[PDB]
Ligand binder design. Structure first.
Ligand SMILES: [Mg+2]
Ligand SMILES: [Zn+2]
Ligand SMILES: [Zn+2]
Ligand SMILES: [Zn+2]
Lengths: 43, 138, 47, 84, 263, 196, 163, 155, 65, 559, 114, 130
RNA sequence: AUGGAGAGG
């Protein structure tokens, strides 16, 4: 529940890669696997 | 009182963040990890705690810095599939499907982040006496 | 322990997922491809 | 037209597909209680009976091997060599 | 006597620590296995719930009800429900005990195992009574009731084997160790530097003689001296646990022999 | 699954007799294979096992926080202070025979979590059942008592094997099969087959 | 590059030569340069080999490249398979791609080509050109729900009175 | 030297000096004609194609050329008589067994080897300074006009 | 939920030791270790059964129904 | 594509899979409920009228039973509802839909079906519990573990098609694959580590255990082999008792490194007449290699004998390992003190070298390599130095490990493990990389806000000194997270593109086969190859042999 | 769901006998006996007590599958010695040893305190 | 009967990463053209350096291995360390130097002599005393 | 049935 209440979606160069600016803002590990990997992120 | 600031990435672009509050002060144990000496001086901000870079599901992982990152990812994706007490009022709610563990237990190896996630109060699993061994081959 | 932050529609608990987008009113210059006639494009999304 | 019994260039050995086909068809015949041409000797499974009936070459079937041009060569099960 | 020997080192109502002398490994291990599982015990097998307005679910309570340690002293003069010619269950195979509880005070009204009331006829047989090793005298905590919560049910206990379900377990954990000096070399010790300094020293090393470096490996040696510690749950006394174990193993061996006589 | 991405299903269940046991008489609630360790490099599994063991013995709460100076050496020392092997190994006995095991076993408490997926909610079997109304093929879904899709890749496999008759059976007798009448002139399904 | 070369005494001995690697490709003019061996010159671009040296050289180069890709991961596939792929890619006369633009423009059955990529338009143009279907294709008999003339179904079974 | 060839010969040879229990201190009961003409007639029965016209025969010899090279290399008179010392019966058994295994190693007509090849190439691709691996394979199969890393190897 | 009646691993009764555990904790002001030691929980599995457990029935009894 | 090229079928099932060391290779563990559900039509014959009558008499719910009874007219008798489910006189010609029983041929399959080994015919063995059970030596061509994997099972409906499965899609036939001209099945996991731990020269087994292992073999002749040790204690060896599983007439020979018919390191592999002479048996032998034992046994004794061999080896090895024991802890990831010191100073001199090269490049004294930038040459040098550092520390950690090290044992056995695992768990996990390059500058002239601008130092650009044992730092953890992220992404992209490409390849080479003239053609009769494989041989019956005519001097050749 | 009953581990089924004595066709003068509803607890003990007899050539037991509570026991004795007699002698030896052990433990327990 | 008999002088002992089996290297005290390499179970029969062991090769003292009964049947040894193996290779160094290779369940053995009745046979009883 | 979300290898 906690995880689903803090989720980020992204529609559509490398938006899937964990960018450096994600430090302290987005969780590096928590992300769906298979399809929407990197697109769907958690705070 | 001007003790803590709110910094976004755009403003984060122009600051120097200290990883630990002990990196402001100016023979060793071989067991501990090798950490780089602070070659920086003009610090403007200091990190609250490096364990805050993780998320809610990833904060349940014991020693995440001792694992391979995709394994931490897998655990972060499988922690949402574990059974336990999701709500205290589970007996008065009419959910389509709900699973509640018979005897939930707070892990023997916890995280200081679990305190704020209320995981020790509402755990999702049990401490099982595990054995790493080749037995019957099953 | 319920933290809230969700809605209730027809008895179903709904959650609005944050939608990521590009920040408007920001000037960005992009290098165009080689087969393209234009070499650089400075664009800005006005909101 | 056809191809004479002589000058047949196809493999004298029975292919695995031909063997599986013959055994399958014969087992189908036995499954529908067809006259057995060999001593059962306890065997009741139509496939196994078909195999034992193949080892004794007591199978009255024939194989029409098609050539890509349209021609075809006939090979009786009794004539084909089963080395598999 | 004439064969195997026992040397009791410690003894209590809950534990027995002893040394088994002149025995084969298979016999000792089999004795352990029998003591763990194949000992007959009495425990709640049936639960008839009338009114259940507490927090816990029905079978959730029935579970811990079944796990409750009951008296199994005279369990041998009781009979299996599958052997008795009675319909369902009777007094010659099962022990019926009721459970009635209700919140009265404003405070949380606890429900223990002391509230279990034997209803069926015991006819002299010491059986059915829930074991209470508790200091206050309460025993196994069943559940907790609020102010207006009620729990009314009826338990039927039957004779069973721990091999069928762990609730019929007469013993907890049985300590077992042979050859504390590894003089038989049944174990290749893992190490980083020193195999002796890293691995702790067992208590049972005081009863045997330390190996001499001037002596070669004794290849003709076998496992004779064993060290055991049997712990009882409370249902059956420790000495009676190991005795019923021995008698059980002996009895099933005698049953196989009987089958040999039959064929 | 554990807490380090080490997931897996139950292979079999053994009673406390058949289970391997330590000298203390303690039997493992769970047995995992060592092969699921080196290829995945989940050291923190072993570390959290050691820490959970020490925290179990000392009765304290093991701190498994991310970036701390708590090392395996300190935990090993704390474990040795309780009279156990500092590296978590325990000499166990084979439950079937009672004989010692040559190699010692990494033995200790580890927080496992029963996941969502269960066999009785996954198992499915259909010899024959309800068809669709448009294609007259077996419906979709376990909850609808449907059949499994014999995908194109499976067809390719059966082609590779050479089992033509089987491929025909799966695509006729197994799924849909229709008897149609065709005109000998135009060659279409115009025929008004008045049977009987 | 190191190289195994037959010694005048007999045995193969390592003889190291100098080889010029190159970013940039124009085989049509590099091989004609005086100074290097114009019989051993090679490019990773088989599309240039097909233009300069011929269709067979393009075949060998294609197989070489595919095999290099497969073996790059340490894997190993037998010769006949990759050779079959390359051959089916080179039997038309040129380099036929493995897409809708390549082999899907062949003179095979309509049902076969309609079971891949462009389905509707293929059926349309086939219905317009009035094409006859051989019905000896796999996917075609698959659609027809018949025992395809493949493997076990490659032949027919009859009966001859020998009893 | 190491190459994939249909019939194994070494395992047959070492199976001949075991099934007959031959001693390495006893003269072979063979003749030069036996070995030479025997092997030379052995290559006659190694049939892949079975036509009677010249073309099919040429394709035949061309198809069994390499295995014939291996056969001659392994069944040389010097090697046969000295390296392992084979008797008459053992040699004949070797010949017959080699012929048999050769006739077994022939591809069976009807073998859908197209799909088999496609699978044999597609399957390892799942387990995957120029461009290599999956993208390069994609370039190859698509026959790309522009490849990401064109190279010129000049000797 | 509520304190488990018996230990999972071995099978030792630990249901009558919960309130005694709490009393050994808050009344005598001892740590968890000594508290679990005095209750006769020598094996760390039985010790785990109480140390690891969380009594959730108290939060459950807060509701009126 | 959805209804014609691949449509949903009846007589099928799907369940979670699991392993079973006591099942044969060509067997499958089918749950009882699935056995009652799935059915097969069997025509009433004088050979099986009794058994069929009994099956009908049992009806549904009870296995072995039947579901429906088809008469002459075609009427379907539902046994679970019929008033006459107790009195049925089976006439000849009637069909009886009975439950799936033992030794029945079914098609086992797991998606994605990449090759023909993904679909293989198995024999049914009805077992309790709701899990599909399979052998541990069939898990490799199916490519499956037991982390919740599900597999599909199809059931044939006629005699010719079950014959088609039993004679073509049979597992023992699919041992040697026509893909890499090698067996695609072998001994793995506990059986491999165990067969490694057993064939050691220090491994001696006494009388009783030897007798048990001997009886564990179904093909055991009942003859006690004379022990390698007569006095003082009658002892056997692992090799000696393992030879019981190996059939007679099996000759295996393999020389590796310093194998001189005596093997001081007990390497190589010599087995004579079904009896192993010397050498430790592991992945190079009992594995799925080209010249492996499995390939030899299969091509010599046959497929059935080879599968039975899988059975025997698995049973024996698993039995010995069961009463021996094997584990793995953190202790097998810890190196010695001075070793860790040498590793640390190795990383130190590495970073020192990187510092020297950096200061050199910043002094504009660096000379660019021909065909690349100064910066590119710099990055290349640094990356190469860090890689050499990770390899140096890794080998330094591997040498320190003992033979009793469990992880090192699993590496030697070939069960599961490699050098890099040891290197990262104990020594150093090394440099992280994204898109071929080290951690770039997400921020302006820097990778993280914790660093200063223009910091091309290794620890900044994504080098991790610490191992998994010591624990990573925040920066190192984030960089490693980036690397792993890219890993997962490019993995998904990889399997997607590979899927589509595989489909394309399949649809391209679909209608290609070999006719009765060894001519590889298509549907148009167009010749692809005049002779298949340019030789006319099947890829299955082909082994890599040495042409000893091409090598050696002319003098040795003439000699 | 598909899980078998628990009593199937110690309660014999319909028509199932306790022992199934079959002539071993491998080596002469041998026997394979199928024990039903019994596990390692009995098999290991019997097998261990069959090796004490010096007139017994072979003695081994095995559980072909942990799912089913049953095990096979192969015994081979010298010529003139029926293996069933060896089995019975071993069993009686077990019984005697267990009885003596029980007596000893009782006499020991009758001297303890607390 | 007996196939070979000689007295050797242990010149080297090597525990190659083992702890139960050590490879021995000895030479004949009679023939200056004879040598022997032999894997030995030290855990049973310890072989120190500079020892003079008595070595013998026999063919007897197939059927299944019956129980010992050494004090009842014909043991025909009274040695200290007896093994059973199988010859697998007959190597000829020179015309005056012939070496044989025995395999005792993995414990290999290389015996180099000159003058032999050691034929390729399963019979290989190696008896060592003192 | 259409459409959509999430999850499993
Ligand atoms: Mg998986
Ligand atoms: Zn009764
Ligand atoms: Zn018409
Ligand atoms: Zn416990």
């Amino acid at each position: 529940t906690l995880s689903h209440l803090r989720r980020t979606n992204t529609p559509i160069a490398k938006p899937r890669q964990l960018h450096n600016t994600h430090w302290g803002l987005v969780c590096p590990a928590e992300t769906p696997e298979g399809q929407a990997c990197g697109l769907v992120k958690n705070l | 009182e001007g003790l803590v600031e709110y910094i976004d990435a755009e403003e984060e672009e122009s600051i120097l963040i200290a990883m630990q509050p002990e990196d402001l002060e100016p023979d060793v144990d071989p067991a501990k990890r090798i950490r780089v000496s602070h070659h920086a001086t003009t610090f403007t901000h200091c990190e609250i705690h490096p364990s805050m870079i993780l998320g809610v599901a990833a904060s349940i992982i014991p020693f995440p810095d001792h694992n391979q990152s995709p394994r931490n990812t897998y655990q972060s994706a499988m922690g949402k599939q574990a059974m336990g007490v999701f709500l205290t009022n589970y007996n008065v709610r009419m959910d389509t499907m709900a699973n509640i563990l018979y005897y939930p237990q707070k892990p023997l190896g916890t995280t200081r982040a679990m305190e704020y996630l209320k995981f020790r109060e509402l755990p999702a699993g049990q401490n099982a006496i595990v054995a790493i061994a080749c037995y019957s081959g099953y | 322990f319920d933290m809230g932050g969700y809605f209730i529609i027809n008895g179903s608990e709904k959650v609005l997922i944050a939608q990521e987008r590009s920040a408007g009113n920001i000037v960005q210059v992009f290098k165009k491809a080689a087969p393209s006639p234009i070499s650089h494009v400075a664009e800005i999304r006005s909101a | 037209k056809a191809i004479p019994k002589d000058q047949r260039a196809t493999t004298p050995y029975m292919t695995k597909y031909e063997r599986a086909r013959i055994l399958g068809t014969r087992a189908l015949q036995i499954s529908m209680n067809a006259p057995v041409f060999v001593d059962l000797e306890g065997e009741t499974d139509p496939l196994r009976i078909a195999m034992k009936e193949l080892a004794e070459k007591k199978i009255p079937l024939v194989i029409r091997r098609y050539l890509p041009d349209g021609s075809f060569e006939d090979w009786s099960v009794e004539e084909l060599i089963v080395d598999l | 006597e004439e064969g195997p020997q026992v040397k009791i080192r410690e003894a209590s109502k809950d534990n027995v620590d002893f040394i088994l002398s002149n025995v084969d490994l298979a016999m000792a291990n089999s004795l352990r296995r029998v003591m763990i599982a194949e000992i007959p015990t009495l425990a709640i097998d049936s639960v008839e719930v009338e009114t259940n307005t507490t927090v816990l679910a029905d079978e959730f309570i029935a579970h811990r009800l079944g796990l409750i340690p009951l008296q199994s002293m005279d369990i041998e003069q009781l009979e299996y429900s599958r052997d008795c010619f009675c319909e369902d269950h009777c007094d010659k195979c099962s022990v019926v005990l009721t459970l009635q509880a209700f919140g009265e005070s404003e405070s949380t009204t606890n429900v223990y195992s002391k509230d279990l009331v034997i209803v069926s006829n015991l006819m002299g047989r010491n059986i059915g009574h829930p074991i209470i090793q508790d200091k206050e005298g309460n025993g196994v905590l069943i559940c907790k009731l609020r102010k207006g919560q009620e729990l009314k049910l009826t338990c039927v206990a039957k004779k069973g084997i721990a091999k069928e379900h762990a609730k019929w377990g007469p013993a907890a954990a049985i300590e077992f160790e042979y050859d504390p000096w590894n003089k038989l070399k049944h174990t290749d010790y893992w190490y980083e530097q020193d195999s002796a300094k890293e691995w702790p020293q067992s208590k049972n090393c005081e009863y045997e003689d330390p190996p001499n470096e001037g002596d070669p490996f004794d290849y003709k040696a076998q496992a004779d001296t064993f060290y055991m510690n049997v712990e009882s749950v409370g249902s059956i006394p420790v000495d009676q646990v190991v005795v019923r174990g021995i008698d059980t193993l002996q009895k099933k061996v005698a049953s196989i022999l009987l089958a040999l006589t039959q064929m | 699954a554990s807490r380090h991405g080490q997931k897996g299903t139950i292979g079999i269940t053994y009673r406390r007799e058949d289970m391997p046991f330590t000298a203390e008489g303690i039997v493992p609630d769970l047995i995992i294979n060592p092969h699921a360790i080196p290829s995945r490099m989940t050291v923190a599994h072993l570390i959290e096992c050691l820490l959970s063991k020490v925290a179990a013995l000392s009765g304290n709460e093991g701190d498994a926080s991310p970036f701390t100076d708590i090392t395996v050496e300190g935990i090993s020392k704390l474990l040795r202070e309780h009279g156990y092997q500092s590296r978590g190994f325990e000499v166990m006995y084979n439950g079937h025979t009672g004989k010692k095991l040559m190699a010692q076993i990494f033995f200790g408490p580890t927080y496992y979590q029963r996941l969502r997926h269960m066999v009785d909610d996954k198992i499915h079997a259909r010899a024959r059942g309800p068809m669709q109304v448009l294609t007259r093929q077996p419906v979709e879904g376990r909850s609808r008592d449907g059949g499994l899709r014999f995908g194109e890749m499976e067809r390719d496999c059966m082609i590779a094997h050479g089992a033509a008759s089987f491929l025909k059976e799966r695509l006729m007798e197994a799924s849909d099969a229709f008897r149609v009448h065709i005109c000998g002139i135009c060659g279409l399904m115009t025929v008004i087959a008045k049977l009987n | 590059y190191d190289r195994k070369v037959p010694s005048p005494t007999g045995e193969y001995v390592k003889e190291p030569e100098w080889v010029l690697e190159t970013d940039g490709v124009n085989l049509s003019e590099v091989m004609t340069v005086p100074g290097i061996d114009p019989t051993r010159i090679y490019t990773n671009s088989f599309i240039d080999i097909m233009e300069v040296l011929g269709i067979e050289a393009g075949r060998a180069a294609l197989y070489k490249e595919v095999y290099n890709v497969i073996a790059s991961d340490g894997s190993y596939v037998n010769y006949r398979h990759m050779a079959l792929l390359v051959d089916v890619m080179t039997t038309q006369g040129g380099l036929t791609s493995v897409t809708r633009h390549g082999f899907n423009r062949s003179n095979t059955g309509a049902l076969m080509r309609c079971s891949f990529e462009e389905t509707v338009e293929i059926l349309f143009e086939a219905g317009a050109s009035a094409e006859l279907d051989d019905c000896r294709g796999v996917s075609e008999n698959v659609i027809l729900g018949q025992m395809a003339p493949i493997g076990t179904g490659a032949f027919d079974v009859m009966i001859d009175e020998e009893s | 030297a190491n190459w994939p060839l249909p019939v194994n010969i070494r395992r047959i040879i070492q199976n001949a000096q075991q099934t007959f229990h031959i001693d390495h201190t006893k003269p072979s009961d063979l003749t030069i004609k036996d070995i030479v003409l025997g092997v030379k007639d052995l290559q006659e029965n190694l049939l892949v194609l079975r036509g009677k016209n010249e073309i099919i025969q040429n394709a035949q010899r061309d198809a069994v050329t390499l295995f014939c090279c291996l056969l001659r290399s392994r069944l040389a008179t010097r090697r046969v008589l000295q390296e392992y010392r084979l008797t008459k019966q053992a040699f004949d058994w070797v010949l017959s067994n080699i012929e048999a295994q050769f006739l077994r190693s022939v591809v069976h007509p009807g073998e859908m080897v197209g799909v088999l090849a496609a699978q044999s190439i597609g399957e390892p691709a799942t387990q995957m300074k120029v461009t290599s691996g999956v993208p390069r394979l994609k370039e190859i199969l698509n026959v790309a006009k522009n490849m990401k890393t064109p190279s010129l190897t000049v000797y | 939920m509520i304190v488990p009646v018996r230990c999972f691993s071995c099978g030792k009764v630990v249901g009558d030791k919960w309130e005694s555990y709490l009393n050994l904790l808050q009344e005598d002001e001892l740590d968890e270790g000594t508290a679990l030691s005095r209750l006769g929980l020598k094996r760390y599995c039985c010790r785990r059964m109480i140390l690891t457990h969380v009594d959730l029935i108290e939060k459950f009894l807060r509701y009126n129904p | 594509r959805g209804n014609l090229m691949g449509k949903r079928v009846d007589f099928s099932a799907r369940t979670v899979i699991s392993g079973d060391p006591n099942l044969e290779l060509d067997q499958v563990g089918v749950p009882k409920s699935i056995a009652k559900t799935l059915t097969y039509p069997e025509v009433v014959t004088p050979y099986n009228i009794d058994r069929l009558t009994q099956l009908v008499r049992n009806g549904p719910n009870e296995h072995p039973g039947a579901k429906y009874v088809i008469r002459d007219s075609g009427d379907r008798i539902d046994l679970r509802y019929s008033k006459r489910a107790g009195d049925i006189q089976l006439q000849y010609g009637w069909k009886v839909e009975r439950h799936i029983m033992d030794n029945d041929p079914v098609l086992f399959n797991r998606q994605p079906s990449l090759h023909k080994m993904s679909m293989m015919a198995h024999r049914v063995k009805v077992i309790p519990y709701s899990t599909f059970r399979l052998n541990l030596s069939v898990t490799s061509p199916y490519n499956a573990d037991f982390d919740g994997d599900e597999m599909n099972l199809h059931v044939p409906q006629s005699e010719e098609t079950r014959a088609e499965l039993s004679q073509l899609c049979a597992v023992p036939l699919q041992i040697v694959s026509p893909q890499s001209n090698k067996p695609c099945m072998g001994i793995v996991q506990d059986t491999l580590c165990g067969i490694r731990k057993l064939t050691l020269r220090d491994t001696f087994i006494e009388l009783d255990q030897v007798l048990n292992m001997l009886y564990w073999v179904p093909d055991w002749d009942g003859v006690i082999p004379t022990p390698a040790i007569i006095k003082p204690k009658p002892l056997w060896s692992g090799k000696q008792i393992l030879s019981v599983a190996i059939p007679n007439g099996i000759h295996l020979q393999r020389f590796d490194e310093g194998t001189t018919l005596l093997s001081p390191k007990d390497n190589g592999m010599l087995i004579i007449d079904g009896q192993i002479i010397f050498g430790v048996v592991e992945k190079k032998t009992v594995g799925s290699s080209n010249g492996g034992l499995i390939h030899v046994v299969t091509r010599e004794k046959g497929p059935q004998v080879c599968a039975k061999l899988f059975g025997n080896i698995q049973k024996v090895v698993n039995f010995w390992l069961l009463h021996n024991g094997f584990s793995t802890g953190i202790g097998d990831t810890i190196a010695d003190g001075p070793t860790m010191r040498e590793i640390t100073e190795t990383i130190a001199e590495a970073k020192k070298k990187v510092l020297d090269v950096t200061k050199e490049a910043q002094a504009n004294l660096l000379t660019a390599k021909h065909g690349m930038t100064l910066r590119e040459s710099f990055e290349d040098n640094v990356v190469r130095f860090l890689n050499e550092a990770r390899d140096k520390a890794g080998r330094l950690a591997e040498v320190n490990l003992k033979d009793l090290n469990n992880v090192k044992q699993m590496v030697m056995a070939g069960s599961k493990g490699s050098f890099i695992n040891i290197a990262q768990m104990s020594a150093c996990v090394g440099q992280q990389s994204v898109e071929g390059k080290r951690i770039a500058f997400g921020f302006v002239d820097r990778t993280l806000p914790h660093f200063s601008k223009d910091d091309y130092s290794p620890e900044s650009k994504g080098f991790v000194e610490n191992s998994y044992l010591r624990g990573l730092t925040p920066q190192e953890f984030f960089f490693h997270a980036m690397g792993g992220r890219e890993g997962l992404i490019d993995t998904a992209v990889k399997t997607a593109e590979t899927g589509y490409i595989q489909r394309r390849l399949v649809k391209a080479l679909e209608d290609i086969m070999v006719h009765y003239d060894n001519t590889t053609r298509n549907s148009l009769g167009n010749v692809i190859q005049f002779i298949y494989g340019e030789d006319g041989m099947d890829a299955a019956h082909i082994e890599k042999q040495s042409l000893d005519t091409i090598g050696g001097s002319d003098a040795a050749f003439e000699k | 769901m598909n899980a078998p009953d628990r009593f199937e581990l110690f309660l014999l089924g319909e028509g199932e006998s306790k022992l199934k004595i079959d002539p071993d066709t491998k080596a002469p003068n041998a026997v394979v006996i199928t024990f039903e509803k019994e596990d390692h607890t009995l098999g290991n003990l019997i097998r261990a007590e069959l090796l004490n007899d010096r007139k017994v050539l072979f003695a081994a037991y095995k559980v072909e599958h942990p799912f089913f509570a049953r095990f096979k026991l192969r015994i081979q004795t010298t010529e003139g010695y029926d293996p069933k007699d060896a089995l019975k002698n071993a069993c009686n030896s077990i019984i005697n040893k267990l009885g003596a052990l029980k007596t000893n433990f009782e006499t020991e327990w009758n001297l303890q305190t607390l | 009967n007996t196939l070979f008999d000689d007295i050797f002088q242990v010149s080297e002992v090597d525990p190659g990463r083992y702890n139960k089996v050590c490879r021995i290297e000895a030479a004949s005290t009679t023939q200056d053209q004879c040598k022997l390499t032999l894997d030995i179970n030290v855990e049973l029969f310890p072989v120190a350096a500079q020892d003079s062991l008595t070595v013998t090769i026999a063919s007897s003292l197939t059927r299944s291995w019956r129980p010992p009964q050494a004090g009842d049947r014909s043991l025909a040894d009274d040695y200290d360390y007896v093994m059973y193996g199988t010859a697998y290779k007959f190597e000829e160094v020179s015309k005056d130097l012939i070496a044989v290779y025995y395999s005792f369940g993995g414990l290999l053995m290389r015996l180099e002599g000159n003058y032999l009745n050691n034929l390729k046979q399963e019979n290989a009883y190696l008896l060592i005393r003192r």
